From a paper:
The enzyme LkcE from the lankacidin polyketide biosynthetic pathway of the bacterium Streptomyces rochei represents an interesting test case for understanding such gain-of-function, as it exhibits a monoamine oxidase (MAO) protein fold yet also carries out a macrocyclization reaction. The catalytic mechanism proposed for LkcE involves initial oxidation of the amide function of LC-KA05 to an iminium ion. This is followed by attack of a C-2 enolate anion on the iminium to give the 17-membered lankacidinol A (2)8—an enzymatic intramolecular Mannich reaction.
Residue numbers in the entry:
A (entry chain B): 2 to 132, 137 to 266, 269 to 438
B (entry chain A): 4 to 133, 139 to 438
């Protein structure tokens, strides 16, 4: 397929992937970016919180990345003159009994006493692993390598749930992803992980992308349908018909399919599994740990847990924002509880967000790769979290891959690691 | 070099011992050791406590499975366990609340320097993927404060370079790598492992495995390559060998060597060292009043002058009671390296005097050049001075020499251990 310059190209979905694709495609082509909600970024949302220090753009979805893991995102932020800061992944885990806890800052707690030897063995086994087990599950490994049910549900499951989704079948996800998160110091039982945050919310780089695009962006304009035709492609958005030569989808595969209007498409876009996530921005200081109230990530398992019913019981993850270095002078509590099990005072709740995260079982990964088939067929292209590897870097680099295929080359060839990532994703996507 | 040859090993530290142990296979080896034990820098001193006798690591104590694969397999095969001893660091300076640590964000120095600690980590991480300059030159060219240089950079580097060392003159890549690999960090404790029951445990085993091939308290006096073979003068006796392997520091190697070739002085002279004094004591007045929970505690004495900063050195204490096996103990276990202030003689268990090599790019360039005199006049060189830094660097150079003498790398199966060996063998130019 040959795509001429100055073509009319639409971008459906304006999250991180859409926005990057739209922004690079604004060079070379005439682009329009359709976004259902009142802002750019989607999972990258920074909610304004009023405080004594000013207005804070509090990250409720996407929060963390770093310069090793996310090179392209890092250069992008740099060039936009956006600073990053270190937000170490300090973790404290609370369970029902007296002193029934553990943390990655000190060696205190009954669970630490009960489990230290397994935390220690785990780190060794994880590190020796990347160097069978090709697509294995973390749960299968734990069982086959004699780890206690206590480690499985009191250590493994909570740590995995500091992201990776609480509702998610965390113990079923790919072994290599856990082995890598541990070797790369993203998760650890002995130290806080090396995580970075963007200066003045993650939205900062999107807010710039938004200005740079200007009139090309349609906020509050949900697409209703994308109909490829003999002539070109027809987009029905915000009660109007639009004529384009190409259409780029940066929406979740389920949304992509509902908007697309062949049953090869139903095969490749249907069956994509998701996990509900509820981010709750609140100020109810009763969620803070009485012993670990100084750690960034605080996990709490409610009363009547019962280790035998462990698959049924679920804990809640709170994020102590006041522990973030920019929020040090701020006097008002800033908490984020994901999927709260116990109650959260409605009087103290700033806002709630309801999102869906893709599952990461090797089958889901196998599904993603297969999309290479419908790429650049009937003037359609697919990018986003569902077409790429996990994380923000994965999403925004996927948008870069599609933009590159439409004659806008990778913006940072100079940056060796950023070029390597792009080469990786382009290869993963089969584009 | 034919099999069943008579080979001597001068120096019985980690490198010697590993080389001797692998060379016991294929050849008839003798291991000469000046001191009463095997290991040298790897020393574990017995300390009596209510819970038991502890083999307290006073020299070499840190490694991990990523950094030290060969050392790790060696320990495993000998049935020796390892534990996590995170590199928690607290830095104390003369004023009120004039400190910083890698566990929390408290302290005046933390307030004064947070932005630079943060910038540093980014710059370090982006660097190996981008420099034969010093850490000091980099710091200066990249606008870092003299406060950062002497109150943050210099103390953190102290953990393994020694409070004395012109640490700021050491190569940049060594710092860039120590930071990217989470060995040193201003935001988290480093992933460091310790051997269970002291580091000596693996040496104590090689000692048994060698038996009568080991000659302790037998300092070599001279190594004279002859027309016939080589002649070793050790403990007032003449010994006849076909090959001689030196696992002693280059300065010691030269003093022992008697060759009449100027080149030897060129390659072995000019090697720079740094004195280190390890002090195993129980004087709790060395613990930080604020950071007494961190593993590595640095203290700069009163009258520090930021302008005279090159002249003043601080002292590094190691809070052993923070180690997980030492958690039930009730007697303080401290190790102060190069104490500036007075340490109570009533509370001093023992002292050790050692010398560490300098790691300026010139020193690194010297090490590589030794490839010239290797396997000449029936002599071979291994050790800390012929290899990259650390215990792995040391024992793997002993393995490289053993492999050159027909004893192949013992762990080809272990992919990372094979890769390290391939690396060192290449670095050494052997
Ligand atoms: C709670 C949460 C926390 C996360 N934390 C991290 C983290 O710290 N780091 C990290 O790297 N990743 C994290 N992620 C993963 C995240 O999904 C990705 O990082 C990335 O943001 C996904 O980008 P995306 O644009 O493909 O998806 P989305 O962000 O979901 O973008 C899709 C967009 O399409 C829009 N859209 C939907 N329907 C229509 C329509 N009809 N017409 C037009 N537009 C439409 C949506 O409104 C949305 O803006 C997190 C995700 C969640 C949900
Ligand atoms: C205080 C200190 C702490 C350290 N901590 C660490 C750490 O945590 N981790 C790490 O990886 N590295 C550490 N090191 C670095 C250390 O030098 C190496 O890890 C390694 O132990 C060096 O091995 P080596 O055998 O080459 O040198 P050495 O250990 O010094 O061995 C040389 C041996 O030669 C002997 N010898 C000297 N003269 C003669 C003679 N005339 N005849 C015969 N034998 C002789 C000596 O007695 C000694 O046993 C530390 C070093 C010191 C001094
Ligand atoms: Na600690
Ligand atoms: Na912290």
């Amino acid at each position: 397929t040959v795509v001429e310059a100055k073509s009319r190209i639409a971008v459906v979905g304006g999250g991180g992937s859409g926005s990057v694709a739209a922004w690079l495609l604004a060079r070379r082509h005439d682009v329009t970016l359709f976004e259902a909600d009142e802002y750019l970024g989607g999972h990258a949302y920074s909610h304004p919180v009023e405080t004594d220090q000013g207005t804070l753009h509090v990250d409720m979805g996407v929060e963390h990345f770093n310069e090793k893991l996310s090179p392209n995102l890092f250069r992008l932020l740099t060039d936009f003159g956006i600073g990053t800061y270190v937000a170490p992944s300090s973790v404290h885990v609370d369970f029902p009994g007296e002193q029934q806890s553990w943390n990655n800052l000190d060696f205190l707690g009954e669970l630490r006493e009960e489990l230290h030897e397994e935390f220690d063995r785990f780190h060794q086994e994880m590190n020796q692993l990347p160097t069978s087990y090709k697509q294995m599950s973390i749960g299968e490994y734990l069982d086959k390598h004699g780890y206690s049910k206590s480690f499985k549900y009191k250590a493994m499951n909570p740590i995995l749930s500091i992201y990776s989704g609480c509702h998610a079948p965390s113990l079923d996800y790919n072994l290599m992803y856990v082995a890598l998160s541990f070797s790369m110091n993203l998760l650890s039982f002995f130290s806080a992980g090396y995580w970075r945050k963007a200066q003045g919310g993650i939205h900062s780089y999107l807010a710039r992308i938004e200005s740079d695009l200007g009139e090309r962006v349609r906020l509050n304009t949900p697409v209703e349908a994308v109909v490829p035709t003999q002539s070109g492609v027809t987009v029905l958005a915000g009660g109007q018909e639009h004529h384009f030569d190409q259409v780029v989808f940066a929406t979740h595969a389920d949304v992509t399919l509902r908007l697309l209007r062949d049953q090869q498409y139903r095969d490749l876009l249907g069956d994509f599994a998701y996990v509900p996530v509820e981010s709750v921005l609140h100020q109810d200081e009763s969620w803070l740990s009485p012993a670990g109230g100084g750690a960034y990530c605080q996990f709490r398992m409610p009363e009547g847990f019962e280790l035998a019913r462990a698959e049924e019981q679920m804990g809640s993850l709170t994020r102590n924002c006041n522990v973030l270095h920019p929020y040090r002078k701020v006097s008002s509590p800033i908490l984020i509880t994901f999927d709260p099990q116990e109650d959260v005072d409605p009087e103290r709740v700033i806002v709630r967000r309801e999102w869906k995260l893709p599952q990461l079982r090797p089958v889901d990964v196998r599904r993603k790769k297969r999309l290479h088939e419908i790429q650049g067929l009937n003037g359609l292209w697919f990018c986003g979290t569902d077409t790429s590897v996990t994380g923000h870097e994965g999403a925004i680099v996927s948008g870069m891959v599609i933009a590159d295929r439409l004659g806008v080359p990778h913006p940072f060839p100079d940056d060796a690691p950023a070029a390597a990532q792009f080469r990786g994703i382009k290869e993963f996507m089969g584009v």
